[PDB]
Amino acid sequence: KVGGNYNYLYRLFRKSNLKPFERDISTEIYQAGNKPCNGVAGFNCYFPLRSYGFRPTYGVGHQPYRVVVLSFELLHAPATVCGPKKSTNLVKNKCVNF
Amino acid sequence: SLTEENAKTFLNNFNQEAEDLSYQSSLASWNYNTNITEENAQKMSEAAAKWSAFYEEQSKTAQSFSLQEIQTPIIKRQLQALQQSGSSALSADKNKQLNTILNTMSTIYSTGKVCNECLLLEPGLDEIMATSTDYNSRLWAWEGWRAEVGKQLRPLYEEYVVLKNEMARANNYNDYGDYWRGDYEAEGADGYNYNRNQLIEDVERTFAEIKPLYEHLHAYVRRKLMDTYPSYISPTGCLPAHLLGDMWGRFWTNLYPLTVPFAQKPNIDVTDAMMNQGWDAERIFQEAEKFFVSVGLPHMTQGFWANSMLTEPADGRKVVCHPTAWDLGHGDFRIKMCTKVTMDNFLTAHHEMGHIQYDMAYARQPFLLRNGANEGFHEAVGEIMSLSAATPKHLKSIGLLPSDFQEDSETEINFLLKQALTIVGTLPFTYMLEKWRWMVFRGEIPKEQWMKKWWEMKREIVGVVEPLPHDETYCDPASLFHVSNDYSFIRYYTRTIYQFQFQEALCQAAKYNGSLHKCDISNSTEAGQKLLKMLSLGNSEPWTKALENVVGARNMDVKPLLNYFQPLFDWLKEQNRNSFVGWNTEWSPYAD
Ligand SMILES: *[C@@H]1O[C@H](CO)[C@@H](O)[C@H](O)[C@H]1NC(C)=O
Ligand SMILES: *[C@@H]1O[C@H](CO)[C@@H](O)[C@H](O)[C@H]1NC(C)=O
Ligand SMILES: [Zn+2]
Incomplete structure (x- = not known):
């Protein structure tokens, strides 16, 4: 945002x-x-959560970057997430591998 | 439980908040500079006030961490760069008085007029002192200016000096001169340690070597001005203060039409050659970017071509119309300049892109160290780019000069003379003015002998004699912009030394065989990675160590300056045979 996107902490x-x-x-x-x-901010008592000053006027190193992390878990439980299976056409009057 | 980690956390928090607050302040300043209005000015003033309040509060809070307990060098340097208070050391009353005196002096200098025509400083006085060649037409203006502005600023300057000395003593210093020289104070190992008092001894040593060249140049200028001023110049005397092409005599570039080695071969100007090819501002910036990338520097950011105002706006926006390199932060580097297709603007574009590339180098350092080594490094890093880009070889490589052209001796001599009239002629003036201000702030010169000692130093150092007697009722030092408005002036001498040092260091590393003034750092990546080694450090290391990374020396060196004008030095020494190089400190134009 031009004014500043201070919603991301x-x-x-x-x-x-x-x-x-x-x-x-x-x-x-x-x-x-x-x-x-005692819940107040000041000397030796700083707030841990700060805000991002996201603005379009930034360069390439301070702009907002979305990062996703996909982690796979393969416990002893049976697997229920398999990749997309392929498919083909049918054959008639000919011995093929099915 | 140690104070070291607590100080580290405090510095981290301070930098995290500063990288936002100073960024907002710089954004407000840029918005004001783009379209100068009242609302933008109010927003910029509010942002600057908030930033100053935050900085002074953090400085007051940081003084509780003495540097003796800090073991880490970078943390100690960051704490030292913030514990410095400055003007807040004085009480409220003294600070208000100093601010009022500064504002009054600035208003008097900005609203100064000399009438017996009736003009002001910049519209009429500058043009007359630059172009007019009449004795009286310049003498009356010079006398009127240094009699009005000097006598109006003297009583205010007398109290300003005392207030600045009180502020310096309150800031644990001795005098204002030491406070100004404290910028060159380095800390580190046994070889990387520099003291403020050592600068006073080193400046004189560096100036002692440039004395013969300056004497030969002054003798040549005097012999060339004897023609236009027959009955106002002595064969073994000094030069008047109003015959130096300027109101004060800082730059002698206005004396080039009167002091030219070979008039039948003028200097090289690529203005028409650039207009024929159909270039413009964006083409100049692209050529500058190509030049800066060829040497092996990082590439420019995209926002430099979209958010920066490279050309004059046609939407009716009123800009200050002067070159500036703004570093807003977080990867935002812009250039505000009244760029045109002229040659001087073509060189100023590269000069500002040098400062931009400098700002793009120390961005990895903490915010408390995002600055050059000293005041003489930031402006000298960009000057070598213009010095290496204004060579006849680079103009032929880019395509401004055709290939059938060949370098001539007379043209090179004229170019060296024109460059020395601007670079070599200002060093004695700067040294004399700084020595005078140092001896006045230190209390060595009594307040009843300001003008006497000032003119004595003008006669001994710069070799300038007054055309009319001026007693202690005037104040000619205060007539300068850098003296009236609070600003340092020793940075120019150090800049002039360091630019030649960097030029020689970057030209010897590329194995160049030729004159020092005809160097070309293009098509040489080794000249960039060796320079960035100093550009990436900034203020995280002492200036001696940063200087050693480029040239190897850990102090100022004037030998590259003498080697830059060596052919011109020989030419002047051969031409000044039928004359006496020097000046006697007894001749006076006002005396019979
Ligand atoms: C700059 O200010 C002038 C004066 O009001 C206005 O006419 C113009 O539209 C402004 N330009 C921009 C880009 O805001
Ligand atoms: C750099 O090398 C290129 C390719 O050989 C050449 O076109 C250009 O003129 C060279 N520039 C300089 C300054 O030597
Ligand atoms: Zn500048």
């Missing part, structure tokens, strides 16, 4: 790194220093 500060396929939606103040934060 991103987490910048956190205690420790995440685990594979883990989600965190907490909005608690990042306790940086020893000072116990």
Whole structure:
């Protein structure tokens, strides 16, 4: 948006790194220093979720990019997602491979 | 639990917020510059005020992290680049007084007029001082200007100096001169450490080597002006201040029609050759992009061709109509210029594209380090591009000059003389003005001997004598734009040194056999990757280390400057045989 698409957020500060396929939606103040934060922002108490300043005037490295990740799971359970099967025509009065 | 990681997190948050706030401020400034209106001006003012408030708040908050505990060098440098307060050190009353004095001086300098015709500074005075050749027609204007503006700015400048010294002392410095020289202060290893006091000793050493060339040039200019000014020039004296082609004497380029080595072979101009081929602004920008890509630099962004205003708008928009390279951030690099099909604009396009490519280099560094090494690097990186693109070989390679043309000696001598009248003639003036301002700010020159010592330095350093006596009632230093409005002036000398240093360093790496002024960095990728090594660092490393990456030296070097004009130096030394190179500091046009 010309004015700015500030609807997309991103987490910048956190205690420790995440685990594979883990989600965190907490909005608690990042306790940086020893000072116990009391829900207010300021010195050593920063908000973890920041916003994107998406604007069309950006270059090629800061524009919004949509990323999809397709992960396949092949547990011992029977598979129910197979690829598209091919097909052919029929044959009459001739021994072929069916 | 250590303060290092806390400072790192604080700097990360500060950079994350700055990359948005400064971007919005630059966008508002660009919107104001495109269409100058009242609403856009108000929006730009509000954005600048918000950015300044955020920056001063973050600076006040960052002063609680002393650099002694920070072990990481880059984090310490980022904290040092922000802990500097500046004008906020003074109290509210002193800051208001300084701001009012600055605004009053700026208003007096901008609204100055000299009448006994009745004109102003830019409309009539500049054209007269540039083109007119009459003694009185220039003398009266010069005297009126330096008697009105000087006497109107003297009482304000006297308090301005004291307020700036108080601000410097409040900012843990000593004087305003040290605060201005603090930009060249480097920190690092034992070999990559530079001090503010060392610049005072190095500038004089670098100026001591350019003295014979400047003396020969001054003698040649005097001998050539003896014809047009028969009864106003001494054979062993200085030159008047109103006969230098400018109100102050900063650029001697206006003396080229009067001081020409060979008039029967004028300079090379590709204006008509560019008009015949049907070129335009976009063609000039495409040729500049091709030149910058041939040397081995990254390619220009797409938004540079869509969002940037390369040509003058025909929609009735009022632009300031002067070249500027804007770096809004996040991959936004634009050029605002009154570009035409002329040759000077053709070179200014490459000069600004150099600054743009510089901005496109240090973008990977943190926001607190997204700037050049010093004030002498950013403007010198772009100048070497214009110096290498204005050669007769590049014009023939691109197609502006036909192949049947051959390089002549007289044309090269005339070109070198015209370039020295603008590049070599300004260095003594800059050095003298900076030395005067340093000795005034440091309190070495009493307030009762400003004009006396100023004119004594004009006689000893620049070799300029006043045509009429001016006592301490005037203030001629304050008559300059850079002196009236708060701005640094030592950056020009360092820029002039570093541009020749970079030119020589990039020409010796490409194995070029010829004159230094006829170099051509085109079709040489090795000249780009060696330059980007300094362009990609910016302010993340001390300026000595960045300078060593290109030329190898960790300080200023004037030998490339003397090697650039070596044929011109020999020609001047051979032509000035029947004369005395120098000037005596006793002759006076006002005295009989
Ligand atoms: C610039 O401002 C003028 C003055 O109102 C207006 O006529 C013109 O349409 C504006 N141009 C743009 C591109 O906004
Ligand atoms: C660079 O090389 C190309 C191809 O050989 C040539 O057309 C062009 O004129 C060269 N440019 C210079 C400046 O030598
Ligand atoms: Zn400029």
